[PDB]
């Protein structure tokens, strides 16, 4: 059911510039922002953020473990593809690593969210990708 999110209304699009959180929650918002991040080679930050969102919704124990593993090897391991996290935040992930839960990565997710909001988002709002997008929906 991204089908219903596919082509966003003007009223949906209107709420995004004043609300990064609203945009980050809309599939079409994230997809637009993800194009812009690709041009700055920082896409992985959003992909990590998305994977942490996907892990939170999961409920079956086995798939939580599989997903937590996948996030670690893709975004947190040194061996890639890695996102920049503080040591404080890395050591909390490591302690949560032997007994995984849906909310293991939340401090790391919040750190990368705050970076995107601070550094990436305001350059997104002045990008051609964005301004061209709002121009089309209007």
Q: Where are the domains of the chain?
A: 1-138
Q: How far apart are the first and last CA of the chain?
A: 25
Superfamily of domain 1-138: Regulator of G-protein Signalling 4, domain 2 (1.10.167.10)
Residue 38: asked if its preceding bond is cis (omega within 30°), the reply is: no
Q: Which technique was used to obtain these atomic coordinates?
A: X-ray
Nearest-angstrom CA–CA distance, 91 and 4: 40
3-state secondary structure of 95: helix
Give 71: exposed, middle or buried? Use CB within 10 Å, 0-12, 13-18, 19+: buried
Resolution as reported, in Å: 2.4
- Tell me which DSSP letter residue 81 carries: -
What Rg, from alpha-carbon coordinates, does the chain have? 16
List alpha helices for the chain, DSSP H: 10-14, 20-25, 27-39, 43-57, 61-71, 87-95, 106-115, 121-124, 128-137
Q: After which residues is the chain broken (C to N over 2.5 A)?
A: 79
Beta-carbon-side half-sphere exposure of residue 56 (alpha carbons within 13 Å):
11
User: Nearest CA to 121 among 13, 37, 25, 15?
Assistant: 37
């Amino acid at each position: 059911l991204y089908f219903q999110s596919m082509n966003p209304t003007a009223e949906e699009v209107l709420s995004w510039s004043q609300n990064f959180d609203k945009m980050m929650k809309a599939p079409a918002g994230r997809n637009l922002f993800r194009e812009f991040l690709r041009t700055e080679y920082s896409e992985e930050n959003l992909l990590f953020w998305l994977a942490c969102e996907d892990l939170k919704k999961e409920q079956n124990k086995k798939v939580i473990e599989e997903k937590a593993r996948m996030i670690y090897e893709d975004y947190i391991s040194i061996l890639p593809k890695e996102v920049s996290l503080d040591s404080r935040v890395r050591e909390v992930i490591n302690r949560n690593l032997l007994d995984p839960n849906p909310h293991m990565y939340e401090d790391a997710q919040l750190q990368i969210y705050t970076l995107m909001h601070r550094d990436s988002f305001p350059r997104f709002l002045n990008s051609q990708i964005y301004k061209s997008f709002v121009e089309s929906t209007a």
